[PDB]
Amino acid sequence: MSHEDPGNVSYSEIGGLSEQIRELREVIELPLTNPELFQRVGIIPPKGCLLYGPPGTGKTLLARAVASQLDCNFLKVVSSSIVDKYIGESARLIREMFNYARDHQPCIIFMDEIDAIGGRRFSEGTSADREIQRTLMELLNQMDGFDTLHRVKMIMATNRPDTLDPALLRPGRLDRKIHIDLPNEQARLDILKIHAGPITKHGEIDYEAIVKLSDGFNGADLRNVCTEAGMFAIRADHDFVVQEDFMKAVRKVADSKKLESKLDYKPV
Amino acid sequence: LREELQLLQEQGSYVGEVVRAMDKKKVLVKVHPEGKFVVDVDKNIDINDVTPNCRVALRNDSYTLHKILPNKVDPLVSLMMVEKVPDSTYEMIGGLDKQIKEIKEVIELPVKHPELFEALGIAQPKGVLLYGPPGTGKTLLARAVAHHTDCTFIRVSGSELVQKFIGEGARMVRELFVMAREHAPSIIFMDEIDSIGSSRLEGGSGGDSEVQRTMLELLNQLDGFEATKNIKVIMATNRIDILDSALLRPGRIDRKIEFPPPNEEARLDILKIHSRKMNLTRGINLRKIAELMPGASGAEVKGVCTEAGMYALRERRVHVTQEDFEMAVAKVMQKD
Amino acid sequence: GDLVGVNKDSYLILETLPTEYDSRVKAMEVDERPTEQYSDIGGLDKQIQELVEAIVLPMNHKEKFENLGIQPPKGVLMYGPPGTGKTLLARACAAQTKATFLKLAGPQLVQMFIGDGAKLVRDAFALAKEKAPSIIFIDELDAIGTKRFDSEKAGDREVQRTMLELLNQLDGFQPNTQVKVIAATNRVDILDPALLRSGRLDRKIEFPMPNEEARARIMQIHSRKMNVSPDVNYEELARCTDDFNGAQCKAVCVEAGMIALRRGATELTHEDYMEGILEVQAKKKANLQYYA
Amino acid sequence: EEERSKVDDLRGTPMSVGTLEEIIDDNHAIVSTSVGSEHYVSILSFVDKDLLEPGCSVLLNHKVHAVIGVLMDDTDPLVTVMKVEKAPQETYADIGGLDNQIQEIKESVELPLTHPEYYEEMGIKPPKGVILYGPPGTGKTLLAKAVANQTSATFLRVVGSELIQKYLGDGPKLVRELFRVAEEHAPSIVFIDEIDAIGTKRYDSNSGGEREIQRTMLELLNQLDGFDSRGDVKVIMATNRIETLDPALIRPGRIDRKIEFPLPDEKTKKRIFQIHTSRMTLADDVTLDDLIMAKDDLSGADIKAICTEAGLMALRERRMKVTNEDFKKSKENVLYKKQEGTPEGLYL
Amino acid sequence: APPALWDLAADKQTLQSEQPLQVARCTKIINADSEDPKYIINVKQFAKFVVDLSDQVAPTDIEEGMRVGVDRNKYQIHIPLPPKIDPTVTMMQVEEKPDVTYSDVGGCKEQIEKLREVVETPLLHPERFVNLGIEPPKGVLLFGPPGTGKTLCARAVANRTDACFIRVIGSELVQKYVGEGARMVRELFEMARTKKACLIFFDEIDAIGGARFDDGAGGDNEVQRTMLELINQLDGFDPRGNIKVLMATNRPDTLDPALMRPGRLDRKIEFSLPDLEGRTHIFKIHARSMSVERDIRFELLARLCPNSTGAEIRSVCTEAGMFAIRARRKIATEKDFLEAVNKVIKSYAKFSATPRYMTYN
Amino acid sequence: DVLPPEADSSIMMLTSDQKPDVMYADIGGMDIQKQEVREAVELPLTHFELYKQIGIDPPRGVLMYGPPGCGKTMLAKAVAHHTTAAFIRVVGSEFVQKYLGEGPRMVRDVFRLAKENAPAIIFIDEIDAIATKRFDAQTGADREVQRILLELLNQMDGFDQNVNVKVIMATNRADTLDPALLRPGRLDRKIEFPLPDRRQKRLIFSTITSKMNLSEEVDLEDYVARPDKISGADINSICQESGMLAVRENRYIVLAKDFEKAYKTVIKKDEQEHEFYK
Numbered sequence A: 001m002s003h004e005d006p007g008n009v010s011y012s013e014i015g016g017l018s019e020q021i022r023e024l025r026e027v028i029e030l031p032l033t034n035p036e037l038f039q040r041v042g043i044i045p046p047k048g049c050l051l052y053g054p055p056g057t058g059k060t061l062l063a064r065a066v067a068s069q070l071d072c073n074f075l076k077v078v079s080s081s082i083v084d085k086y087i088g089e090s091a092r093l094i095r096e097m098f099n100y101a102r103d104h105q106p107c108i109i110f111m112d113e114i115d116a117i118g119g120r121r122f123s124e125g126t127s128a129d130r131e132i133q134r135t136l137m138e139l140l141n142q143m144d145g146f147d148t149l150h151r152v153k154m155i156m157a158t159n160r161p162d163t164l165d166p167a168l169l170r171p172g173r174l175d176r177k178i179h180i181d182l183p184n185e186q187a188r189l190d191i192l193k194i195h196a197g198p199i200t201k202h203g204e205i206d207y208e209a210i211v212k213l214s215d216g217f218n219g220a221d222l223r224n225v226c227t228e229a230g231m232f233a234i235r236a237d238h239d240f241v242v243q244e245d246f247m248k249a250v251r252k253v254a255d256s257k258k259l260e261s262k263l264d265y266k267p268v
Numbered sequence B: 001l002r003e004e005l006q007l008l009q010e011q012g013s014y015v016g017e018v019v020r021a022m023d024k025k026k027v028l029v030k031v032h033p034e035g036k037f038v039v040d041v042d043k044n045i046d047i048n049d050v051t052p053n054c055r056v057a058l059r060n061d062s063y064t065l066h067k068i069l070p071n072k073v074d075p076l077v078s079l080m081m082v083e084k085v086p087d088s089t090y091e092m093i094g095g096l097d098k099q100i101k102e103i104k105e106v107i108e109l110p111v112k113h114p115e116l117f118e119a120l121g122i123a124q125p126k127g128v129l130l131y132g133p134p135g136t137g138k139t140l141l142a143r144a145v146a147h148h149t150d151c152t153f154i155r156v157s158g159s160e161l162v163q164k165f166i167g168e169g170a171r172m173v174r175e176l177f178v179m180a181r182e183h184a185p186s187i188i189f190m191d192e193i194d195s196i197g198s199s200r201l202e203g204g205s206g207g208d209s210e211v212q213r214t215m216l217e218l219l220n221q222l223d224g225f226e227a228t229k230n231i232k233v234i235m236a237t238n239r240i241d242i243l244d245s246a247l248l249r250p251g252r253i254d255r256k257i258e259f260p261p262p263n264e265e266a267r268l269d270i271l272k273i274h275s276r277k278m279n280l281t282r283g284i285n286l287r288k289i290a291e292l293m294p295g296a297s298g299a300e301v302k303g304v305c306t307e308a309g310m311y312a313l314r315e316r317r318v319h320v321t322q323e324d325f326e327m328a329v330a331k332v333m334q335k336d
Numbered sequence C: 001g002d003l004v005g006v007n008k009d010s011y012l013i014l015e016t017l018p019t020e021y022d023s024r025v026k027a028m029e030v031d032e033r034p035t036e037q038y039s040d041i042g043g044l045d046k047q048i049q050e051l052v053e054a055i056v057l058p059m060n061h062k063e064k065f066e067n068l069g070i071q072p073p074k075g076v077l078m079y080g081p082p083g084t085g086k087t088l089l090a091r092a093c094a095a096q097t098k099a100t101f102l103k104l105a106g107p108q109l110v111q112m113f114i115g116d117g118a119k120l121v122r123d124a125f126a127l128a129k130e131k132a133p134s135i136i137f138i139d140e141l142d143a144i145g146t147k148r149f150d151s152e153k154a155g156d157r158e159v160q161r162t163m164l165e166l167l168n169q170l171d172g173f174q175p176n177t178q179v180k181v182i183a184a185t186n187r188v189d190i191l192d193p194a195l196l197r198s199g200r201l202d203r204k205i206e207f208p209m210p211n212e213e214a215r216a217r218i219m220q221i222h223s224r225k226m227n228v229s230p231d232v233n234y235e236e237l238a239r240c241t242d243d244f245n246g247a248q249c250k251a252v253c254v255e256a257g258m259i260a261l262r263r264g265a266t267e268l269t270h271e272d273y274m275e276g277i278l279e280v281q282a283k284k285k286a287n288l289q290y291y292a
Numbered sequence D: 001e002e003e004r005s006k007v008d009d010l011r012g013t014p015m016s017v018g019t020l021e022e023i024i025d026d027n028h029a030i031v032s033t034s035v036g037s038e039h040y041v042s043i044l045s046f047v048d049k050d051l052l053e054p055g056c057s058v059l060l061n062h063k064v065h066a067v068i069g070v071l072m073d074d075t076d077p078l079v080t081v082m083k084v085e086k087a088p089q090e091t092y093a094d095i096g097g098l099d100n101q102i103q104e105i106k107e108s109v110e111l112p113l114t115h116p117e118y119y120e121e122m123g124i125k126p127p128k129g130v131i132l133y134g135p136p137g138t139g140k141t142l143l144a145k146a147v148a149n150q151t152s153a154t155f156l157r158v159v160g161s162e163l164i165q166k167y168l169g170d171g172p173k174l175v176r177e178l179f180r181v182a183e184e185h186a187p188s189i190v191f192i193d194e195i196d197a198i199g200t201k202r203y204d205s206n207s208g209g210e211r212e213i214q215r216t217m218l219e220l221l222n223q224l225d226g227f228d229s230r231g232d233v234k235v236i237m238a239t240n241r242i243e244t245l246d247p248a249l250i251r252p253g254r255i256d257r258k259i260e261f262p263l264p265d266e267k268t269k270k271r272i273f274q275i276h277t278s279r280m281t282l283a284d285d286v287t288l289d290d291l292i293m294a295k296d297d298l299s300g301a302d303i304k305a306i307c308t309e310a311g312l313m314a315l316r317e318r319r320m321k322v323t324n325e326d327f328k329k330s331k332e333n334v335l336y337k338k339q340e341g342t343p344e345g346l347y348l
Numbered sequence E: 001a002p003p004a005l006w007d008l009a010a011d012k013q014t015l016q017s018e019q020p021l022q023v024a025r026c027t028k029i030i031n032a033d034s035e036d037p038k039y040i041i042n043v044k045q046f047a048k049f050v051v052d053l054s055d056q057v058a059p060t061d062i063e064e065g066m067r068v069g070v071d072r073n074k075y076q077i078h079i080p081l082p083p084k085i086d087p088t089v090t091m092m093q094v095e096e097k098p099d100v101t102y103s104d105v106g107g108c109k110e111q112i113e114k115l116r117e118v119v120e121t122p123l124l125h126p127e128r129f130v131n132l133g134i135e136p137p138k139g140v141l142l143f144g145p146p147g148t149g150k151t152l153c154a155r156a157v158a159n160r161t162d163a164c165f166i167r168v169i170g171s172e173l174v175q176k177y178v179g180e181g182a183r184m185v186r187e188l189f190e191m192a193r194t195k196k197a198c199l200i201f202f203d204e205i206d207a208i209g210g211a212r213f214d215d216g217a218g219g220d221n222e223v224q225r226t227m228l229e230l231i232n233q234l235d236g237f238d239p240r241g242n243i244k245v246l247m248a249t250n251r252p253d254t255l256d257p258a259l260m261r262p263g264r265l266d267r268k269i270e271f272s273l274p275d276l277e278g279r280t281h282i283f284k285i286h287a288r289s290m291s292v293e294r295d296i297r298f299e300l301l302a303r304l305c306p307n308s309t310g311a312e313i314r315s316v317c318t319e320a321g322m323f324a325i326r327a328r329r330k331i332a333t334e335k336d337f338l339e340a341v342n343k344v345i346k347s348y349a350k351f352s353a354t355p356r357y358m359t360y361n
Numbered sequence F: 001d002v003l004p005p006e007a008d009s010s011i012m013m014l015t016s017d018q019k020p021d022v023m024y025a026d027i028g029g030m031d032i033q034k035q036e037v038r039e040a041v042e043l044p045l046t047h048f049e050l051y052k053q054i055g056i057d058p059p060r061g062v063l064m065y066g067p068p069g070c071g072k073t074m075l076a077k078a079v080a081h082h083t084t085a086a087f088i089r090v091v092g093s094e095f096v097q098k099y100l101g102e103g104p105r106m107v108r109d110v111f112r113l114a115k116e117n118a119p120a121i122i123f124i125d126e127i128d129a130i131a132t133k134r135f136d137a138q139t140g141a142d143r144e145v146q147r148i149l150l151e152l153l154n155q156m157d158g159f160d161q162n163v164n165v166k167v168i169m170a171t172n173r174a175d176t177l178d179p180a181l182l183r184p185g186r187l188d189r190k191i192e193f194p195l196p197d198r199r200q201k202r203l204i205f206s207t208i209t210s211k212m213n214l215s216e217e218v219d220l221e222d223y224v225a226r227p228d229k230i231s232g233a234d235i236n237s238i239c240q241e242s243g244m245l246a247v248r249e250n251r252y253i254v255l256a257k258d259f260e261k262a263y264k265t266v267i268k269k270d271e272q273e274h275e276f277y278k
């Protein structure tokens, strides 16, 4: 019950992708405030979506901020609850968790890190892969109703979408597939303003040297670069730092992250 | 009933399962959800009717065995054996008459003849093989020769539930080699898991090449010990890798039968064979109607009658005019 | 809740009893403080400052962060070819800082019963919210972070879901920034790109083989707990070391101390160092013949 | 007599069958019965506690959860397979024609048991068994001594095959097969035949493939290596072709005697068929001069097969007759069978 | 029956003592403690029980994760039971009784000497290496040509000073159960530290050490459970361990466990294998076998059988007595069996010459 | 006293009567396909004197394999338009419980109402799960439900003969199924749903655009060509994604850029250095 995310604004402040903010806005939040728009024209809202990664960041945040933006309604699901125990009884708990997900209207369903509990039947393994499919049956059954369907929005997330099997790879269950791209020039000044936040610096500065030296980075990685440059200030016993020592701490740490950037290639 | 109910009132009364019997008169009891129990005598019915694995009633108080109950062990197996094949006696088989004279002397000899083995000078045959493009009658002939031979027939894999009732760490086909001996002496078959997947025994060897060891070890006992004789097998395959079955068996000692493709002598009688269960007229000539289809498969014989029989099912009349008889041939010629 | 006491079949609860559960899941390992301190590493003073900072700065320097808007690092990736003395250096920094240490390993989260190590982080990070750092240290994050390519699944199943859950509660829940977690890997071959985040791995420094000055240092500073032989130039044993591990340098003084038994004298010479230095590496024990 | 009517009130009449978990030096014996229940059992009765060992079928009295004694264990479906003996129905009168091979290994199989005096003075001893190999029956060639070893001590035949036997592998229950048969007598002869590892069409179900079939064979080593086994369990391995055993595996065994039987010659084939037919001939009258002269050449395998169909085709006449046009025509089938693959080569 | 008479007749005092401790069912694990009197406990019945403890047991003896007795009526703690573990898995792990004493060595000196001082010497004289410390190494390794494998581990069995030690092989830990290996290696040292003096041994790490990663589908990743977790559990600091464990395998493979050990373990030796003058040492122990003629020269036949270790020349004195009874004679002169020895090397080299170079290559 | 019989069991049936789903008139032009369907559907439902006459015993077996594409449940609710009968709908995992004693009773209570009530149709989705064979004790209940599958298999011959049942079976992957389950004498008819290929293309674009908003302006001519090139397929419900990009609008009548953008993302093609021979 306690999951919370801001925005509205903080969702639109992520800087990209611009059209993806325009996606789940009217897909998720809009059905509650104006359900008449969809039913009059006759177009059905999507019953599912899939956000993968990480070509950049934003797989979770994109669906996460619009999750509590619909209303105070949300239900958060962690992949740790599906595995349960030996002879796991969570088959009725997946039904129980979704039963109390319908206690919240309109409901929203999350699934994160499905590359674990999404076990593939391609090469037939131990029966643990079978009970994975049984937990999938508990997911689909209640969402196949006979009950609230078009009103509830299910979300799943994965590292790579080769684990979905031909069932989840198909639309229906998993409908929308969206990836993330990089920002552009003069848009770097935009995403910058929202990354300013708590950390402040000298009065006369130009932030373009900071962010340009780090390209293709997580929003927290650039947030780390701002703090890493700010943690160099305490070594200089000053509140701010000149941009010459900035670019030093900016360039060094950034080039160290790029050597760890391997395995960004993901299957389609 | 009131006084007897007071005996059954406290805990009720249970039903146990005896895994083994002792001469000390203590009988082991086992309930399915519960653990194994054991109890002192407990003597009601004659002891000779009490055998391991048999179902027995259980009293609540002394936890003794009140009666003896008929169990089912062979019915389990035999029910799976009747799933794979119908009865299919000699009157249900035809066209193999040349081959049934080849197979009988192998099948009939250990059941009746064997005292003439030493006279004929040949060891007990290890089995028979039938190979050819399907085709049918290879399975129907299994229990056919065995029906008039008076010997009962047991069927084949998958088995498929013998991976629990018989343990996993157990030797499988060696444990099935026990089931054939536990049952009355019978005959076996190979069905089927012979597929076109690409070409190989790769997937068939699980239910075939491993059962090739079953025919050896069964007849090795029958020679050596236990009792009594009468254990046989029949192979069902098509083409290609049968030569590997001839590599496994260097001709010692296997009866020679080549399972034929559908033949004129085969289609003639095997048609009337399947027309005995249905009531039709005699106005149909079985001779020439079989010669117009020199090909396809033996299962097409049943495809003629049954599949095209739905057209006579369309007009709501038990019999149809000759115009449909040519249509019955016209349907089977489009798939050719 | 749960855990409350109630009497037999009367079904009355007298008092609501804490705290959570269960057995080793509640407390993975109880560690007071190590016998060693951060001073035990020679030549690493350049890359220990980055380490010491991220753990120490959120405690004493927190008051300066609210003024300047500074966010303390959470995860740190400490990796190098063994022996790098990583696990000794990590825990030793918790001795002087009073930080309560908790011992945990990656493969320890895999059990027969599914859903064990995954539920542990639900318990582990709940204590990270309850308790103040202190510290948590783990090892072999690279292996357990292996998603393969074609799944499912690996042998690391419970932990690869646990790690990405350990990474998830850092993402979705802001209060999780409490009780910074240290991670350690013995190889960079397999690295999850999701590990990049503020709450996730931030400080990363590649550990190469220490230089000739550092290799001579560490061998002396590992021996400060024991007797150190006099008459040592320290220059010859330093330059003769190429690619030799720091843990092997400890074995140099071992083998040189093992031969001291049969030699009859506990005193060692400067030539005995380079004797045990060339001993363990390159390889053993053969010699070059037939090679012209 | 009186003990039967005495302890019965002390244990029964009703009681349960549990399993043993662990034993404490305080005389409390922890037992576990279905399902998930423990207890402290202190009993001085009938034990025998040392011979028990855990995993046992030991009983648990109803009042209250005490073990009075044991009965027996069968056990499992696994034991019912072989049922002894095997008795010598494969006779030395079914084999013949091999001399230089039959003399040497006859000593090794008879080296234990009789003549113990110079065997114990040695003290190193070769209690490794033997090893066989080779197609088609080269491994079956000296199998006739294994059945000749059924006239005394005990014999065991274990089919190696390829697929059906899988398990973990870990080989947990096949060591049980070897152990339970040696508990009856304890001399032993253990025979393995037809290793298909090189000739596999594919891997079976979820095993491996590739190296996992190798590691269960490496476990087949570690079992057989082995630590720690002293007595016999005489190990005998056989196959059609062995590339399998690593240079490490042959060192424990068989480092002494492994056999190879060359293809038979005119002297062996005549001694093979005449001895095979010593029990039963066909129409008597059989002369072996023209039999080996007509077909040149092939192993004595198919010479029984052509004679199998000889009285079989004559059985259409229900006992005895020979048709000159039909017999040579029926012989043409097997004659061409070997005459399709006649050349190699010039195998030379 | 007379031994079973007084044996069965003791039930009179039994049933009197059977009433106490009868309620101990079942074994239950505790969870946490909010206060001193009351602890939460969980039992295998799946039902968790908060309860206080009887006045007979002190509260300080109850530690988190301790299985204790119970009174099914009052649910109160009765008596603690030390073992928490483990179902099966012990019988193949536990090894007892000696065999294969030191006299079975085949002449290798420096090899067996430096691996004797890693185990037998520190435990026989604990004060020695503690005062001489420095510090003992954290482990050893064994691999090479097969001779002599698995015997050097049997050497420490009969040379064992006080208490028997544990043997473990890789294929017994396969799954089925995952996580036993962790749980196992943790408890055996906890069981150790009480009595100390218990060695831990692992055999055949090559099959379970498959490294590193493949495309898919794994494959090696399920094998990473065996190699990486065992090395990680070896990589602890406690202490670690007191007995400094042991290692034995066939090939040096794979690279990852081979590069992990120098950071922890030490003393990697390569067999050795016989010296040209050391092949007669295996003939010395065999010179006591049966009756050896004094004309026999062991230095003559040693050179004729290269890379024979002690296994292949064990067949020499075997084939000696083998063909001795075949020929009905009694003793075996040198020229007698060596004529068969030149055959046993060549005729057994027709199919395979027994190279080890091709294994790792 | 026993039950009447019966009180039946838990869960539920029917729920397929809401309407509308699919009209059968699409195949009405052939009459070659419907003639075989007409004889295989309504006559096997209730007919009596016609069988014993000809002597052919109609099988109860219906096995549906071949997805993708979906097929299946369309023809299920379509039969509900054709005829009216009680539909038992349960997932293959629905009867998995914590105890193994209730399992044999549930599948017995499901099949005993099939012979009790007529006509009856029972639909179980993807039983290939429990078809997995594992002897382990923790999977013993998992193997206990596969013998339950073999139990209800023993119960499906109790329907023989002839009254009464209709057994429709559907599975996404039949490789894990046992040979005796697909063997005749129990299931004698294997209905293989064909791969969508070229045929199901144009039919499946037409059924979604009827549910889409008109499209009286939007001209389907260009969307049956360019998006048809990049189709995976990725056939049935990506056409729904083409409609789920209309809710992305922001536009009253779906723009041409909305459709084209939907299909071009999945799935990508990489050309052409090779197939250029065409």
Ligand SMILES: Nc1ncnc2c1ncn2[C@@H]1O[C@H](COP(=O)(O)OP(=O)(O)OP(=O)(O)O)[C@@H](O)[C@H]1O
Pocket: A166, A167, A168, A170, A172, F067, F069, F070, F071, F072, F073, F074, F172, F204, F207, F236, F237
């Ligand atoms: N004209 C159509 N052609 C194909 N499929 C359709 C059509 N109309 C609807 N569907 C799809 O059929 C689905 C219902 O089928 P069902 O409930 O049997 O699951 P399923 O499709 O078999 O699942 P899976 O594809 O994973 O096996 C609905 O989700 C719907 O999207």
Ligand SMILES: Nc1ncnc2c1ncn2[C@@H]1O[C@H](COP(=O)(O)OP(=O)(O)OP(=O)(O)O)[C@@H](O)[C@H]1O
Pocket: C040, C041, C042, C044, C082, C083, C084, C085, C086, C087, C088, C139, C184, C185, C186, C210, C218, C222, C245, C246, C247, C248, C250, E235, E263, E264
């Ligand atoms: N660069 C170094 N600085 C200080 N000590 C070192 C260094 N390299 C090796 N050592 C010493 O070598 C010994 C072996 O420690 P090692 O580095 O193998 O642990 P580790 O590999 O970090 O452990 P883990 O694999 O669990 O991370 C330590 O006692 C340490 O003192």
Ligand SMILES: Nc1ncnc2c1ncn2[C@@H]1O[C@H](COP(=O)(O)OP(=O)(O)OP(=O)(O)O)[C@@H](O)[C@H]1O
Pocket: A013, A014, A015, A016, A053, A054, A056, A057, A058, A059, A060, A061, A062, A191, A194, A195, A218, A219, A220, A221, C170, C171, C193, C194, C195, C196, C197, C198
């Ligand atoms: N555009 C952004 N603006 C502000 N903060 C951001 C932005 N992108 C990422 N972050 C920060 O990074 C953290 C992780 O965000 P996100 O969930 O998008 O990445 P992730 O999913 O953890 O990475 P991965 O996709 O590799 O798993 C969040 O706590 C958030 O504060």
Ligand SMILES: Nc1ncnc2c1ncn2[C@@H]1O[C@H](COP(=O)(O)OP(=O)(O)OP(=O)(O)O)[C@@H](O)[C@H]1O
Pocket: D225, D226, D248, D249, D250, D251, D252, E104, E105, E106, E107, E108, E143, E144, E145, E146, E147, E148, E149, E150, E151, E248, E249, E250, E251, E273, E274, E282, E309, E310, E311, E312
């Ligand atoms: N020098 C020697 N002295 C005594 N015995 C020897 C010697 N060399 C070999 N042996 C004997 O040869 C036998 C065969 O060794 P074995 O093949 O079992 O080694 P291994 O365990 O396979 O080696 P690895 O584990 O490296 O594969 C051993 O039992 C050993 O006693």
